Design an enzyme around this catalytic site. Structure first.
Site, PDB file in Angstrom:
ATOM      1  N   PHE A   1     -67.661  50.873-135.401  1.00 26.87           N
ATOM      2  CA  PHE A   1     -68.960  50.952-136.092  1.00 26.87           C
ATOM      3  C   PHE A   1     -69.837  51.934-135.061  1.00 26.87           C
ATOM      4  O   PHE A   1     -69.939  51.601-133.763  1.00 26.87           O
ATOM      5  CB  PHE A   1     -69.543  49.450-136.307  1.00 26.87           C
ATOM      6  CG  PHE A   1     -68.971  48.962-137.488  1.00 26.87           C
ATOM      7  CD1 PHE A   1     -67.432  48.550-137.634  1.00 26.87           C
ATOM      8  CD2 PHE A   1     -69.566  48.602-138.618  1.00 26.87           C
ATOM      9  CE1 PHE A   1     -66.950  47.852-138.535  1.00 26.87           C
ATOM     10  CE2 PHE A   1     -68.978  48.076-139.745  1.00 26.87           C
ATOM     11  CZ  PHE A   1     -67.599  47.539-139.605  1.00 26.87           C
TER      12      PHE A   1
ATOM     13  N   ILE B   1     -73.570  52.991-135.163  1.00 31.38           N
ATOM     14  CA  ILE B   1     -74.825  53.107-136.093  1.00 31.38           C
ATOM     15  C   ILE B   1     -76.315  53.540-135.047  1.00 31.38           C
ATOM     16  O   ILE B   1     -75.935  53.247-133.733  1.00 31.38           O
ATOM     17  CB  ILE B   1     -75.366  51.530-136.719  1.00 31.38           C
ATOM     18  CG1 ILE B   1     -74.273  51.391-137.859  1.00 31.38           C
ATOM     19  CG2 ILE B   1     -76.946  51.298-136.968  1.00 31.38           C
ATOM     20  CD1 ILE B   1     -72.828  51.275-137.426  1.00 31.38           C
TER      21      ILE B   1
ATOM     22  N   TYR C   1     -75.557  54.781-131.431  1.00 27.69           N
ATOM     23  CA  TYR C   1     -74.286  54.575-130.993  1.00 27.69           C
ATOM     24  C   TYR C   1     -73.446  55.796-131.508  1.00 27.69           C
ATOM     25  O   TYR C   1     -72.311  56.002-130.908  1.00 27.69           O
ATOM     26  CB  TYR C   1     -73.700  53.344-131.393  1.00 27.69           C
ATOM     27  CG  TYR C   1     -73.918  52.211-130.618  1.00 27.69           C
ATOM     28  CD1 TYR C   1     -75.345  51.511-130.738  1.00 27.69           C
ATOM     29  CD2 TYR C   1     -73.440  51.982-129.282  1.00 27.69           C
ATOM     30  CE1 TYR C   1     -75.745  50.505-130.023  1.00 27.69           C
ATOM     31  CE2 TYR C   1     -73.575  51.038-128.526  1.00 27.69           C
ATOM     32  CZ  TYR C   1     -74.619  50.206-128.814  1.00 27.69           C
ATOM     33  OH  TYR C   1     -75.398  49.352-127.967  1.00 27.69           O
TER      34      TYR C   1
ATOM     35  N   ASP D   1     -64.802  48.888-130.283  1.00 27.00           N
ATOM     36  CA  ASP D   1     -66.501  49.449-130.252  1.00 27.00           C
ATOM     37  C   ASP D   1     -66.385  50.874-129.999  1.00 27.00           C
ATOM     38  O   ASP D   1     -65.476  51.282-129.225  1.00 27.00           O
ATOM     39  CB  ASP D   1     -67.371  48.616-129.360  1.00 27.00           C
ATOM     40  CG  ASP D   1     -67.626  47.344-129.721  1.00 27.00           C
ATOM     41  OD1 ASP D   1     -67.664  46.976-130.791  1.00 27.00           O
ATOM     42  OD2 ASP D   1     -68.251  46.626-129.030  1.00 27.00           O
ATOM     43  N   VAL D   2     -67.336  51.680-130.358  1.00 22.69           N
ATOM     44  CA  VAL D   2     -67.432  53.172-130.106  1.00 22.69           C
ATOM     45  C   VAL D   2     -67.895  53.398-128.746  1.00 22.69           C
ATOM     46  O   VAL D   2     -67.557  54.670-128.002  1.00 22.69           O
ATOM     47  CB  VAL D   2     -68.358  53.816-131.140  1.00 22.69           C
ATOM     48  CG1 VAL D   2     -69.895  53.324-130.736  1.00 22.69           C
ATOM     49  CG2 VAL D   2     -68.099  55.380-131.244  1.00 22.69           C
ATOM     50  N   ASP D   3     -68.846  52.935-127.968  1.00 21.20           N
ATOM     51  CA  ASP D   3     -69.234  53.042-126.744  1.00 21.20           C
ATOM     52  C   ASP D   3     -68.308  52.937-125.681  1.00 21.20           C
ATOM     53  O   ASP D   3     -68.354  52.188-124.669  1.00 21.20           O
ATOM     54  CB  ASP D   3     -70.572  52.414-126.397  1.00 21.20           C
ATOM     55  CG  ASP D   3     -70.517  50.830-126.480  1.00 21.20           C
ATOM     56  OD1 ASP D   3     -69.690  50.412-127.334  1.00 21.20           O
ATOM     57  OD2 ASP D   3     -71.033  50.329-125.512  1.00 21.20           O
TER      58      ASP D   3
ATOM     59  N   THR E   1     -67.013  31.210-121.454  1.00 19.40           N
ATOM     60  CA  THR E   1     -68.258  31.221-122.008  1.00 19.40           C
ATOM     61  C   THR E   1     -68.118  30.996-123.563  1.00 19.40           C
ATOM     62  O   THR E   1     -68.762  31.677-124.407  1.00 19.40           O
ATOM     63  CB  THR E   1     -69.177  32.294-121.948  1.00 19.40           C
ATOM     64  OG1 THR E   1     -68.514  33.572-121.972  1.00 19.40           O
ATOM     65  CG2 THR E   1     -69.444  32.624-120.309  1.00 19.40           C
TER      66      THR E   1
ATOM     67  N   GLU F   1     -67.709  37.071-130.969  1.00 16.42           N
ATOM     68  CA  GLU F   1     -67.018  36.962-130.072  1.00 16.42           C
ATOM     69  C   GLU F   1     -66.323  35.370-129.809  1.00 16.42           C
ATOM     70  O   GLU F   1     -65.433  35.106-129.579  1.00 16.42           O
ATOM     71  CB  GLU F   1     -67.318  37.444-128.625  1.00 16.42           C
ATOM     72  CG  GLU F   1     -66.314  36.912-127.389  1.00 16.42           C
ATOM     73  CD  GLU F   1     -66.669  37.839-126.372  1.00 16.42           C
ATOM     74  OE1 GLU F   1     -66.197  39.395-126.307  1.00 16.42           O
ATOM     75  OE2 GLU F   1     -67.299  37.324-125.365  1.00 16.42           O
TER      76      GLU F   1
END
Ligand SMILES: [Hg+2]
Ligand SMILES: [Hg+2]
Ligand SMILES: [Hg+2]
Ligand SMILES: [Hg+2]
Length: 263
Positions: free
Chosen positions: A59, A61, A64, A129-131, A163, A221
């Site tokens: 994704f 958007i 990004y 993710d794209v980054d 976490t 997550e």
């Protein structure tokens, strides 16, 4: 099911471990993928004979979309090279998608922001993710019905330190005495059927949570971790598959840094 051809490679050593510094198999007998545990030539043969197609979804958007060029360029160099790949880029800026040159047998679909589509176009789905950028080999060794990736910040942590969502009021709740590993919400995959199964469960769990006015500590997550705790993954990827050298350096336990965040 098709027979493999004659192949010449080193004989496996029954009395010699393939890594003595890390766990290479989970308690439910799912392999944990580390460099040195697999012969990529054998795996490539197995998947190619099945004419395997891998879908990679991302994704992008707003701001990004700026990460797409590097993401796709590096994927072209390291992701499932030699196999059929179908990139699915979900974005709110179709015209802003970079014109990246793709290798043969690889295609990209831009979807502006239809699930049966996946079932007919690909055999496996990989969600990231794209980054990010690929820095080394990420191939068919990861393919399996359902896989999760060990979070680079917690692979050596005790379950109490994970976490996970700790509030009983949340559907993602996991008590301190439960948990196998802390998986990344941003790098998972498997067969189309299993991936849609996981996302459908996550979506439903998150709706229940909001109806109760609660939001899991790490959102998607947290729920992914609850799902993989109750539905054991058939393969677990080592942190080699999602690292951050800026924050974690390059430990001796990591022979390769394959996929990382862009500083
Ligand atoms: Hg996906
Ligand atoms: Hg879930
Ligand atoms: Hg979700
Ligand atoms: Hg999820």
């Amino acid at each position: 099911m098709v027979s493999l051809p004659r192949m010449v490679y080193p004989q496996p050593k029954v009395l010699t471990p393939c890594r003595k510094d890390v766990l290479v198999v989970t308690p439910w007998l799912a392999p944990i993928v580390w460099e040195g545990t697999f012969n990529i030539d054998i795996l490539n043969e197995q998947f190619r004979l099945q004419n395997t197609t891998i879908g990679l979804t991302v994704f992008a958007i707003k701001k990004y979309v700026a990460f797409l060029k590097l993401f796709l360029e590096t994927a072209e160099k390291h992701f499932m090279v030699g196999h059929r790949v179908h990139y699915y880029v979900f974005t709110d800026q179709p015209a802003a998608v970079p014109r990246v040159t793709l290798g043969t047998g690889r295609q990209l679909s831009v979807l502006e922001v239809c699930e049966r589509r996946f079932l007919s176009e690909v055999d496996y789905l990989v969600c990231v993710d794209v980054d990010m950028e690929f820095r080394d080999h990420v191939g068919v060794e990861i393919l399996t019905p359902l896989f999760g990736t060990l979070h680079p910040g917690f692979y050596g942590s005790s379950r109490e330190a994970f976490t996970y969502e700790r509030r009983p009021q949340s559907q993602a709740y996991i008590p301190k005495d439960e948990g196998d590993f802390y998986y990344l919400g941003r790098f998972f995959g498997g067969s189309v059927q299993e991936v849609q199964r996981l996302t459908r469960a996550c979506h439903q769990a998150m709706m229940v949570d909001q109806a109760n006015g609660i939001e899991a500590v790490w959102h998607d997550e947290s729920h992914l971790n609850k799902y993989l705790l109750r539905h054991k993954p058939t393969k677990v990827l080592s942190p080699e598959y999602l690292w951050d050298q800026q924050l974690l350096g390059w430990p001796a336990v990591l022979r390769k840094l394959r996929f990382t965040a862009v500083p």
